[PDB]
Design a protein around this nucleic acid. Structure first.
Ligand SMILES: [Mg+2]
Ligand SMILES: [Mg+2]
Ligand SMILES: [Mg+2]
Ligand SMILES: [Mg+2]
Ligand SMILES: [Mg+2]
Ligand SMILES: [Mg+2]
Ligand SMILES: [Mg+2]
Ligand SMILES: [Mg+2]
Ligand SMILES: [Mg+2]
Ligand SMILES: [Mg+2]
Ligand SMILES: [Mg+2]
Ligand SMILES: [Mg+2]
Ligand SMILES: [Mg+2]
Ligand SMILES: [Mg+2]
Ligand SMILES: [Mg+2]
Ligand SMILES: [Mg+2]
Ligand SMILES: [Mg+2]
Ligand SMILES: [Mg+2]
Ligand SMILES: [Mg+2]
Ligand SMILES: [Mg+2]
Ligand SMILES: [Mg+2]
Ligand SMILES: [Mg+2]
Ligand SMILES: [Mg+2]
Ligand SMILES: [Mg+2]
Lengths: 102, 147, 203, 52, 46, 210
RNA sequence: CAGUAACGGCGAGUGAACAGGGAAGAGCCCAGCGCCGAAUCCCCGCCCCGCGGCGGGGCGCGGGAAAUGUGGCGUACGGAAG
RNA sequence: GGCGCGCCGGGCCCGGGUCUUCCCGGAGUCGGGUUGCUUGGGAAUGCAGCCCAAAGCGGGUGGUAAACUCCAUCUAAGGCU
């Protein structure tokens, strides 16, 4: 059969040969460099945590993930930022458990 | 020209074409299209039916470029190509059939309205109709899609 | 470099180091006067990324805008007109208190030019902003090529045409589909281009 | 006001119809004397001079 | 003026090793601290 | 107060429109001012092209206009690099650059690379100091014959290839185009929900093979 | 584009933008990350020149600014070093 | 006055390709809640006050609120022309 290039359908469009160049250097912003990770961990070891995230670490220590997520979702903003901050507080709290372990 | 209008013939006549009993007052029925529901009801029912009210879905950020697909008919399909292609195709006995690219002409969709003359064609369109395609097939010819 | 640590440290603001620092600075700034010169910037990294190079002729002020919305300056109640415009108490003002800060700093110093400004402290009833100011007729400014753009008459009182960053945030401009009601030079220029009949010669 | 519609536009083929009628009535000697040009001693009315 | 005598020294020496020093400034100090080219850091208290 | 029959309409004169009316009586004065400025600029850049720099074949974006080729903004950096031209030397030898343009195809990139190589064949670069020619400078025969070309430099017209009259294979005469269009419409519309129904059917095969 | 999409006791009224064609067309610089003995800037005094846009060159164990950061390279089109 | 040209004094002693190793970003701001104004912008287009207030394969945009999952596109909160 003949498969003509069609304007509609799941593989629609005029068929062109997609070249592959490296992505532009504007695109890499906020990739975590190891030096800024070092600076940021040093700053956190200087100054510690905020009160809302301390209260969220108490809720995560008692392992109430739903109310901890609702708490961070209120006091930060979007649900995406809520999930990300809940999981980095879970990583911080796990590192504290391992520090108390050995 | 104000030489030819009506206000020249209406000098001397006291009311100037607007009556003595009901004068030419300023706005006796409201400004503009006012009183649509209330006191020009009979005009907006007898002459503009369907005017008040909502119907249909709201499309917010509309783009005619997205919804662009103009049409040609089979009746004027052979307009798009010059006359010597028709007469060479009819003159030809080898069975070779000319190719009408309608997108080069600028019409995206072939519709089938009229009679199409009995010559084999290859109509290279973007979209087709069922009757346009089956008239092309019944004359003998092919329907080629191009995105 | 130190300024990366200083900017991450200033980023962490409910950390009790920075709560102590901002509280004690805010106490001192309330004890001081409303429009007084600071001898050097409190946030040197923020000053340097907003334009302050610590050379002769740049001046930091430390100004106190009183905090709050804007109740309508009418007699007792009494906006004499239709009930849409009756409201006085819950009205909000079109420009940020940072821009009002730059405005009255650059009004009090008319011989200088407002480069930009930043935040230093707040409490319930005041916010404090430190404003960066360039003296244009100093020759460390006038002989440097990449900062003698400030010494031209077009840039006269930037804070009142609304051209510093705290004024640009309140004009509703920038690229996008969000900013259709400013296309043209400004919002007024958008409106003025839209509400004119272009009556041609030949129509 | 100043925004009176002072200017009128004419279709191009109407302008060219007019320029052809204006040229073609400048060869008929009745239609030039009626316009009034004192012409009775012109040797022929589509008057052509050598381009020196 | 010590740098002026050093530059006059090398100028007329050419026309005829740097000793170790302190490194001031909190930027240069914290860069060579985090690259570990320091040996002692003195920090003002006030 | 409308009459018997007629289009009811919304004239936007309810504002104060007479105070803001822009009338065009300086239209021909504007045209004469612009062409005086255009002649002055075209003689002050004296052998250089009057139209300005060269600008690439680039294709109009949307569904209404993607069959049309225009002259664009500037040559992309990928195009300049494949044509060997340095991104800061291009603006000096007369080539327009923008850094923002992507390249997602190969046909358009090879078209612009061919256009840049054709431009570097055509241009006559005069020496920097005229008494002392250098290596990358054109020869004194064509330095005398170089002049301004008017119109856009290497104009872009929309060429359409001509496909000659074939005979028709019966595969072409048995391609069902309308049913193929509607069947592709339906497949692309129902692709996702068929995927989740295949997911649920295979998961029910899981729950009662386990 | 378009009196369109849209807003509106969806009543009266209000009402953009994308795309396309033209006028014109030009791009760049910091902070940060850095590496260079602050390599940087202002001002006073004298010598020469020019001076009705106070500027160029030289000498000052002349005074300041600046390490709480000036200048040189460098800015997302990546960039630096070898 | 400017475009032409010569002479002195002074500045700079500059570039490109490939390979290897490095380095890279603007915070009471973004964003969320609410309130008022404005917008054609409609479960909120823009602006501002108050409260909360971040992140770094992050963040914004993707014209119907939200969750999940791919993509596409830019790089904000600094500045000149
Ligand atoms: Mg009468
Ligand atoms: Mg009458
Ligand atoms: Mg009467
Ligand atoms: Mg009447
Ligand atoms: Mg009566
Ligand atoms: Mg009337
Ligand atoms: Mg009634
Ligand atoms: Mg009202
Ligand atoms: Mg904002
Ligand atoms: Mg009547
Ligand atoms: Mg129309
Ligand atoms: Mg109603
Ligand atoms: Mg309005
Ligand atoms: Mg456009
Ligand atoms: Mg042009
Ligand atoms: Mg620089
Ligand atoms: Mg520096
Ligand atoms: Mg950029
Ligand atoms: Mg208002
Ligand atoms: Mg307002
Ligand atoms: Mg309103
Ligand atoms: Mg920037
Ligand atoms: Mg910007
Ligand atoms: Mg500007």
């Amino acid at each position: 059969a003949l498969r003509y290039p069609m304007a509609v359908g799941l593989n629609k469009g005029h068929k062109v040969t997609k070249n592959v160049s490296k992505p532009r250097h504007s695109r890499r912003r906020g990739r975590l460099t190891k030096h800024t990770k070092f600076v940021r961990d040093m700053i956190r070891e200087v100054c510690g945590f905020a009160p809302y995230e301390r209260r969220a670490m108490e809720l995560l220590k008692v392992s109430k993930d739903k109310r901890a997520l609702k708490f961070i979702k209120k006091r930060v903003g979007t649900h995406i930022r809520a999930k990300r901050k809940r999981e980095e507080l879970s990583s911080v709290l796990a590192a504290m458990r391992k520090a108390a372990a050995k | 020209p104000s030489r030819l209008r009506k206000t020249r013939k209406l000098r001397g006549h006291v009311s100037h074409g607007h009556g003595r009993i009901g004068k030419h007052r300023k706005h006796p029925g409201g400004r503009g299209n006012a009183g649509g529901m209330h006191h020009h009801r009979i005009n907006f029912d007898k002459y503009h039916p369907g005017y008040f009210g909502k119907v249909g879905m709201r499309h917010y950020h509309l783009k005619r470029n997205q919804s662009f697909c103009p049409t040609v008919n089979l009746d004027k399909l052979w307009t798009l190509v010059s006359e010597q292609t028709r007469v060479n195709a009819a003159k030809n006995k080898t069975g070779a059939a000319p190719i009408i690219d309608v997108v080069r002409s600028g019409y995206y969709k072939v519709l089938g309205k009229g009679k199409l003359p009995k010559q084999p064609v290859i109509v290279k369109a973007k979209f087709f109709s069922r009757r346009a395609e089956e008239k092309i097939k019944g004359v003998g010819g092919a329907c080629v899609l191009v995105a | 470099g130190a300024y990366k640590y200083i900017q991450e440290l200033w980023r962490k603001k409910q950390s009790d180091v920075m709560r102590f620092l901002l509280r004690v600075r805010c106490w001192q700034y309330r004890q001081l006067s409303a429009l007084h010169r600071a001898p050097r910037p409190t946030r040197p990294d923020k000053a340097r990324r907003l334009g302050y190079k610590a050379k002769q002729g740049y001046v930091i002020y430390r100004i106190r805008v009183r905090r709050g919305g804007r109740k309508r300056p009418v007699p007792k109640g009494a906006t004499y007109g239709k009930p849409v415009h009756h409201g006085v108490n819950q009205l909000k003002f079109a420009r940020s208190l940072q821009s009002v800060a730059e405005e009255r700093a650059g009004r009090h110093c008319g011989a200088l030019r407002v480069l930009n400004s930043y935040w230093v402290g707040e409490d319930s009833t005041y916010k404090f902003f430190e404003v960066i100011l360039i003296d244009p007729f100093h020759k460390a400014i006038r002989r440097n090529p990449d900062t003698q753009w400030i010494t031209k008459p077009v840039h006269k009182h930037r804070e009142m045409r609304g051209l510093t960053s705290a004024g640009r945030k309140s004009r509703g401009l920038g690229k996008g589909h969000k900013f259709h009601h400013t296309i043209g030079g400004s919002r007024r220029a958008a409106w003025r281009r839209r509400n004119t009949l272009q009556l041609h010669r030949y129509r | 006001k100043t925004w009176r519609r002072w200017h009128r536009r004419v279709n191009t083929t109407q302008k060219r119809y007019a320029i052809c009628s204006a040229l073609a009535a400048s060869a008929l000697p009745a239609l030039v004397m009626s316009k009034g040009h004192r012409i009775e001693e012109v040797p022929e009315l589509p008057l052509v001079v050598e381009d020196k | 003026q010590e740098k002026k005598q050093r530059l006059l020294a090398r100028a007329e020496k050419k026309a005829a090793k740097r000793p170790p020093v302190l490194r001031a400034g909190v930027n240069t100090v914290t860069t060579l601290v985090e690259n570990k080219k320091a040996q002692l850091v003195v920090i003002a208290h006030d | 107060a409308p009459s018997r029959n007629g289009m009811i309409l919304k004239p936007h004169f309810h504002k104060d429109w007479q105070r803001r009316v822009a009338t065009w009586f300086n239209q021909p004065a504007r045209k004469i001012r612009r062409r005086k400025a255009r002649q002055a600029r075209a003689r002050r850049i004296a052998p250089r092209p009057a139209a300005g720099p060269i600008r690439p074949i680039v294709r109009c974006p949307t569904v209404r206009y993607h069959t049309k080729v225009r002259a664009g903004r500037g040559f992309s950096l990928e195009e300049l690099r494949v044509a060997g031209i340095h991104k800061k030397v291009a603006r000096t030898i007369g080539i327009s650059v923008d850094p923002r343009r992507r390249n997602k195809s190969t046909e358009s990139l090879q078209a612009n690379v061919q256009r840049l190589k054709e431009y570097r064949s055509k241009l006559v670069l005069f020496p920097r100091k005229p008494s002392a020619p250098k290596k990358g400078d054109s020869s004194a025969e064509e330095l005398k014959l170089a002049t301004q070309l008017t119109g856009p430099v290497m104009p872009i017209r929309n060429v359409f290839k001509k496909e000659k009259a074939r005979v028709i294979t019966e595969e072409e005469k048995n391609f069902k185009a309308f049913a193929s269009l509607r069947m592709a419409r339906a497949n692309a519309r129902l692709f996702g929900i068929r995927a989740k129904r295949a997911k649920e059917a295979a998961e029910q095969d899981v729950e009662k093979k386990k």
